Design a protein around this motif. Structure first.
Motif, PDB file in Angstrom:
ATOM      1  N   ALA A  13      -3.995   0.923   8.309  1.00  0.00           N
ATOM      2  CA  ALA A  13      -3.868  -0.050   9.397  1.00  0.00           C
ATOM      3  C   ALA A  13      -3.485  -1.425   8.833  1.00  0.00           C
ATOM      4  N   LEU A  14      -2.630  -2.133   9.552  1.00  0.00           N
ATOM      5  CA  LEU A  14      -2.069  -3.369   9.017  1.00  0.00           C
ATOM      6  C   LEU A  14      -2.235  -4.454  10.051  1.00  0.00           C
ATOM      7  N   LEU A  15      -3.085  -5.417   9.734  1.00  0.00           N
ATOM      8  CA  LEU A  15      -3.344  -6.527  10.630  1.00  0.00           C
ATOM      9  C   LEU A  15      -2.504  -7.700  10.158  1.00  0.00           C
ATOM     10  N   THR A  16      -1.829  -8.376  11.076  1.00  0.00           N
ATOM     11  CA  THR A  16      -1.011  -9.512  10.701  1.00  0.00           C
ATOM     12  C   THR A  16      -0.958 -10.534  11.841  1.00  0.00           C
ATOM     13  N   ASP A  17      -0.382 -11.701  11.575  1.00  0.00           N
ATOM     14  CA  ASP A  17      -0.126 -12.668  12.643  1.00  0.00           C
ATOM     15  C   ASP A  17       1.101 -13.488  12.302  1.00  0.00           C
TER      16      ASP A  17
ATOM     17  N   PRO B 203      -5.316 -10.224   4.339  1.00  0.00           N
ATOM     18  CA  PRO B 203      -6.016  -9.497   3.280  1.00  0.00           C
ATOM     19  C   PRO B 203      -7.372  -8.891   3.708  1.00  0.00           C
ATOM     20  N   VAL B 204      -7.609  -8.732   5.005  1.00  0.00           N
ATOM     21  CA  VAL B 204      -8.907  -8.242   5.476  1.00  0.00           C
ATOM     22  C   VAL B 204      -9.066  -6.745   5.205  1.00  0.00           C
ATOM     23  N   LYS B 205     -10.293  -6.323   4.918  1.00  0.00           N
ATOM     24  CA  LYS B 205     -10.605  -4.912   4.751  1.00  0.00           C
ATOM     25  C   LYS B 205     -11.058  -4.356   6.098  1.00  0.00           C
TER      26      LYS B 205
ATOM     27  N   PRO C 237      -2.684   2.355   0.236  1.00  0.00           N
ATOM     28  CA  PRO C 237      -2.317   2.000   1.613  1.00  0.00           C
ATOM     29  C   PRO C 237      -3.005   0.710   2.120  1.00  0.00           C
ATOM     30  N   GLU C 238      -4.225   0.411   1.672  1.00  0.00           N
ATOM     31  CA  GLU C 238      -4.934  -0.830   2.061  1.00  0.00           C
ATOM     32  C   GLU C 238      -4.353  -2.102   1.464  1.00  0.00           C
ATOM     33  N   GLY C 239      -3.492  -1.963   0.470  1.00  0.00           N
ATOM     34  CA  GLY C 239      -2.948  -3.125  -0.198  1.00  0.00           C
ATOM     35  C   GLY C 239      -3.661  -3.489  -1.484  1.00  0.00           C
ATOM     36  N   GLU C 240      -4.597  -2.649  -1.938  1.00  0.00           N
ATOM     37  CA  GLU C 240      -5.272  -2.885  -3.206  1.00  0.00           C
ATOM     38  C   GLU C 240      -4.415  -2.383  -4.364  1.00  0.00           C
ATOM     39  N   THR C 241      -4.535  -2.997  -5.531  1.00  0.00           N
ATOM     40  CA  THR C 241      -3.678  -2.590  -6.630  1.00  0.00           C
ATOM     41  C   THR C 241      -4.502  -2.084  -7.808  1.00  0.00           C
ATOM     42  N   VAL C 242      -4.024  -1.008  -8.417  1.00  0.00           N
ATOM     43  CA  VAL C 242      -4.620  -0.485  -9.625  1.00  0.00           C
ATOM     44  C   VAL C 242      -3.559  -0.395 -10.707  1.00  0.00           C
ATOM     45  N   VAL C 243      -3.870  -0.908 -11.888  1.00  0.00           N
ATOM     46  CA  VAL C 243      -2.964  -0.771 -13.007  1.00  0.00           C
ATOM     47  C   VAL C 243      -3.068   0.674 -13.509  1.00  0.00           C
ATOM     48  N   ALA C 244      -1.919   1.325 -13.689  1.00  0.00           N
ATOM     49  CA  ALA C 244      -1.873   2.717 -14.135  1.00  0.00           C
ATOM     50  C   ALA C 244      -1.062   2.802 -15.427  1.00  0.00           C
ATOM     51  N   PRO C 245      -1.744   2.935 -16.566  1.00  0.00           N
ATOM     52  CA  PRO C 245      -1.021   3.014 -17.835  1.00  0.00           C
ATOM     53  C   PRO C 245      -0.125   4.230 -17.869  1.00  0.00           C
ATOM     54  N   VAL C 246       1.018   4.112 -18.537  1.00  0.00           N
ATOM     55  CA  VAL C 246       1.932   5.225 -18.627  1.00  0.00           C
ATOM     56  C   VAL C 246       2.476   5.395 -20.035  1.00  0.00           C
ATOM     57  N   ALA C 247       1.881   4.729 -21.013  1.00  0.00           N
ATOM     58  CA  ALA C 247       2.263   4.989 -22.404  1.00  0.00           C
ATOM     59  C   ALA C 247       1.179   5.789 -23.118  1.00  0.00           C
TER      60      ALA C 247
ATOM     61  N   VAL D 116       5.100  -7.279  -6.383  1.00  0.00           N
ATOM     62  CA  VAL D 116       3.864  -6.573  -6.032  1.00  0.00           C
ATOM     63  C   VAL D 116       3.227  -7.182  -4.795  1.00  0.00           C
ATOM     64  N   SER D 117       3.175  -8.512  -4.759  1.00  0.00           N
ATOM     65  CA  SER D 117       2.611  -9.216  -3.617  1.00  0.00           C
ATOM     66  C   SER D 117       3.381  -8.856  -2.328  1.00  0.00           C
ATOM     67  N   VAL D 118       4.700  -8.732  -2.414  1.00  0.00           N
ATOM     68  CA  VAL D 118       5.480  -8.272  -1.256  1.00  0.00           C
ATOM     69  C   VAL D 118       5.050  -6.854  -0.828  1.00  0.00           C
ATOM     70  N   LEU D 119       4.929  -5.959  -1.796  1.00  0.00           N
ATOM     71  CA  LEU D 119       4.609  -4.561  -1.505  1.00  0.00           C
ATOM     72  C   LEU D 119       3.195  -4.351  -0.970  1.00  0.00           C
ATOM     73  N   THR D 120       2.234  -5.182  -1.393  1.00  0.00           N
ATOM     74  CA  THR D 120       0.848  -5.034  -0.913  1.00  0.00           C
ATOM     75  C   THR D 120       0.761  -5.387   0.556  1.00  0.00           C
ATOM     76  N   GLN D 121       1.788  -6.051   1.087  1.00  0.00           N
ATOM     77  CA  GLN D 121       1.766  -6.430   2.496  1.00  0.00           C
ATOM     78  C   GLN D 121       2.583  -5.512   3.377  1.00  0.00           C
ATOM     79  N   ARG D 122       2.938  -4.345   2.874  1.00  0.00           N
ATOM     80  CA  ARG D 122       3.691  -3.446   3.717  1.00  0.00           C
ATOM     81  C   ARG D 122       3.142  -2.039   3.673  1.00  0.00           C
ATOM     82  N   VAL D 123       3.403  -1.312   4.748  1.00  0.00           N
ATOM     83  CA  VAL D 123       3.020   0.077   4.841  1.00  0.00           C
ATOM     84  C   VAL D 123       4.311   0.865   5.009  1.00  0.00           C
ATOM     85  N   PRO D 124       4.729   1.587   3.959  1.00  0.00           N
ATOM     86  CA  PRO D 124       6.048   2.230   3.951  1.00  0.00           C
ATOM     87  C   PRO D 124       6.384   3.067   5.201  1.00  0.00           C
TER      88      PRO D 124
END
Length: 234
Positions: free
Chosen positions: A41-45, A95-97, A171-181, A217-225
């Motif tokens: 769910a995406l709340l905005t104004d 940024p509300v949960k 989907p909530e807009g939270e970010t996790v760093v995921a190592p890939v090396a 990243v900040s752009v992507l955390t505000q969208r739901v694909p």
């Protein structure tokens, strides 16, 4: 107090809720609480949207300027990233949960609602979205148990890609760093509907564009694909 227009999944029917004083009151309304998939769910104004649009246009302008100045191999990667981002429909996001089952700590964790808001909703997806300096970007089937590195086995990295990390954006807009090396290996399994962003290496990014990964990243955390439903535009 707050008035919220709710678009149901598909965006073809709306509900109206309000006046509501705060987020806890909104998500517990009987017509919503046990009905919505809250993480998506995406709340905005109006204000959040205006800021997100400004931020997004800034990202796109930086990508274009850098593209003109970069080595040809790097420029081709930038062009691909630019094309992946060209048709985002910018809504902004507060940024509300929203989850009714979250334990709220501190008074400020139940934000007051003042004025008009829009709530967009989706059903829990069966895919994830892979974006960035990576081949075969787009929607991938979500598979139980699969790690970020598993998903990437079939997606060669592009010139100038970050060699160390993927950003998982839930989907909530939270970010996790995921190592890939190999050297920083850490097992991370992205949930349904996440975005996997593979950004630019620190080595390739000129100082004037240093913030660019974080800005994207900040752009992507505000969208739901999934929202991208549109008929007569891409």
């Amino acid at each position: 107090q707050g008035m919220v227009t709710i678009y149901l999944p598909g965006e073809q029917q709306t509900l109206s809720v309000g006046p509501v004083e705060n987020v806890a009151q909104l998500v517990t309304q009987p017509q919503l609480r046990d009905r919505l998939w809250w993480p998506g769910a995406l709340l905005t104004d109006s204000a959040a949207k205006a800021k997100a649009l400004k931020d997004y246009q800034h990202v796109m302008a930086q990508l274009a300027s850098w593209e003109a100045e970069a080595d040809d191999d790097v420029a081709a990667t930038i062009k691909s990233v630019r094309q992946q981002l060209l048709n985002l429909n910018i809504t902004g996001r507060l940024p509300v949960k929203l989850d009714p089952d979250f334990v709220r700590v501190d008074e400020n964790s139940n934000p007051p609602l003042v004025g008009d808001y829009t709530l967009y909703t989706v059903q829990r997806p069966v895919t994830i979205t892979l974006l960035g300096a990576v081949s075969g970007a787009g929607q991938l089937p979500w598979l139980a148990g699969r790690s970020v590195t598993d998903y990437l086995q079939d997606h060669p990295r592009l010139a100038g890609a970050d060699k160390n990390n993927v950003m998982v954006i839930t989907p909530e807009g939270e970010t996790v760093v995921a190592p890939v090396a190999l050297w920083n290996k850490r097992h991370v399994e992205p949930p349904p509907g996440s975005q996997l962003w593979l950004g630019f290496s620190a080595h390739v990014l000129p100082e004037k564009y240093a913030d660019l990964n974080d800005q994207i990243v900040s752009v992507l955390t505000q969208r739901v694909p999934e929202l991208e439903h549109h008929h007569h535009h891409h």
